[PDB]
Amino acid sequence: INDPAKSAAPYHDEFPLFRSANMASPDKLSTGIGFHSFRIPAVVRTTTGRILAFAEGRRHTNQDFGDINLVYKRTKTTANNGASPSDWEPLREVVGSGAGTWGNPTPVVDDDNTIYLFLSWNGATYSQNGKDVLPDGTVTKKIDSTWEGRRHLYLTESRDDGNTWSKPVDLTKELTPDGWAWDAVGPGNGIRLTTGELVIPAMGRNIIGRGAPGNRTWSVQRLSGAGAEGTIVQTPDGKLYRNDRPSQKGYRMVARGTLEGFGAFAPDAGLPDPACQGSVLRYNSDAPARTIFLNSASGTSRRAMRVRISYDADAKKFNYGRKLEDAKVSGAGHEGGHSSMTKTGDYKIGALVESDFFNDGTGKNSYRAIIWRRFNLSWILNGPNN
Numbered sequence: 374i375n376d377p378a379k380s381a382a383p384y385h386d387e388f389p390l391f392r393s394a395n396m397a398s399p400d401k402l403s404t405g406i407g408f409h410s411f412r413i414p415a416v417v418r419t420t421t422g423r424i425l426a427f428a429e430g431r432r433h434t435n436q437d438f439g440d441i442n443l444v445y446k447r448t449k450t451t452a453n454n455g456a457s458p459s460d461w462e463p464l465r466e467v468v469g470s471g472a473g474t475w476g477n478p479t480p481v482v483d484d485d486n487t488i489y490l491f492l493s494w495n496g497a498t499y500s501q502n503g504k505d506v507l508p509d510g511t512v513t514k515k516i517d518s519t520w521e522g523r524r525h526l527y528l529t530e531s532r533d534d535g536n537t538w539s540k541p542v543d544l545t546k547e548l549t550p551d552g553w554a555w556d557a558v559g560p561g562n563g564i565r566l567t568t569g570e571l572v573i574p575a576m577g578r579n580i581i582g583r584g585a586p587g588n589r590t591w592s593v594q595r596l597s598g599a600g601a602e603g604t605i606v607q608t609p610d611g612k613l614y615r616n617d618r619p620s621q622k623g624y625r626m627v628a629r630g631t632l633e634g635f636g637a638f639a640p641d642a643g644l645p646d647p648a649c650q651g652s653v654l655r656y657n658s659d660a661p662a663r664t665i666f667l668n669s670a671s672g673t674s675r676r677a678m679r680v681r682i683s684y685d686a687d688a689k690k691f692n693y694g695r696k697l698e699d700a701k702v703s704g705a706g707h708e709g710g711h712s713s714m715t716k717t718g719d720y721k722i723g724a725l726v727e728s729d730f731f732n733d734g735t736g737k738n739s740y741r742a743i744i745w746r747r748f749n750l751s752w753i754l755n756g757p758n759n
């Protein structure tokens with residue numbers, strides 16, 4: 374019942390980290406290439422303490438298809454914990470080749486500090502639904518099972534604390550089942566287990582990394598009833614926990630297991646979700662062991678962001694937690710959507726959260742920004758709705 378964290382001084386601060394084209398000082402690459410929207414956050418802390426924040430740079434509209442580059446920012450130092458805007462480097466690019474889609478960033482930090490980044494890719498003229506109009510009037514083909522038309526799975530890595538990245542290597546044939554069309558990895562993060570393996574959540578499956586850090590052998594763990602956009606965590610009991618986006622609005626879909634297999638997925642009645650990506654973080658295993666979860670706590674809206682704590686050895690139940698709106702950001706639109714969480718070096722939680730200006734309503738011209746938040750456990754625990 375007791376948590377010493379509640380007695381600590383509560384701490385929170387927050388600011389836009391990826392600034393859309395409509396904002397003052399919009400984020401652009403050194404080449405001058407700019408972006409209508411930033412969506413699909415992912416964040417990890419490396420073994421040095423540096424924080425790496427990734428996003429999809431959606432060039433022309435907020436849509437999932439078309440020219441989309443994989444962008445990122447690092448903290449300028451390994452020790453600043455991204456505490457203020459001046460602590461963050463300017464926008465950089467992992468990969469932006471062609472006019473197709475580079476996205477679904479799903480990083481994991483390995484023991485040697487190799488940072489692996491799993492990505493999804495699709496071609497310039499394809500979209501999930503097909504028949505979508507591109508900025509030049511071109512109508513998309515529907516993503517299909519052909520080599521040119523399917524979703525690919527790519528892997529890149531950094532050996533220098535995120536400073537540079539390898540040209541992504543196509544692992545589709547090795548790590549995506551044959552005959553698939555649509556695919557997704559993450560988005561959000563993979564994990565490293567107490568037992569040494571890596572686990573990367575993907576559509577219908579986990580990707581497992583074994584062997585030498587930064588030199589892993591990869592394999593596929595097929596799952597029954599998993600979602601397209603999954604999250605993974607090792608719960609305090611040492612078991613695995615998939616907490617996935619549902620296909621229809623309702624509740625997060627949860628399954629538990631090990632590297633030998635998972636039980637059935639079932640909705641978690643305690644975690645409503647509007648059919649949107651969420652994030653999960655293993656905080657600590659010593660008493661009192663904690664798992665952190667973040668999503669929109671709503672069956673209908675993405676604007677109900679709520680960070681929560683579970684003390685359960687199997688993360689069966691999360692507390693009410695705290696609404697992010699208790700510490701709202703002004704000037705970056707309506708917060709809510711995808712999220713990704715990391716621990717920081719100064720005993721805080723760092724979270725990236727989508728925001729939507731909604732200037733074009735549900736339309737393609739609605740600018741999307743990404744907020745960076747830091748808060749401690751005390752902040753969560755001192756929420757008025759617990």
Ligand code: NA
Pocket residue numbers: 440441442469470471472473
């Ligand atoms: Na591009």
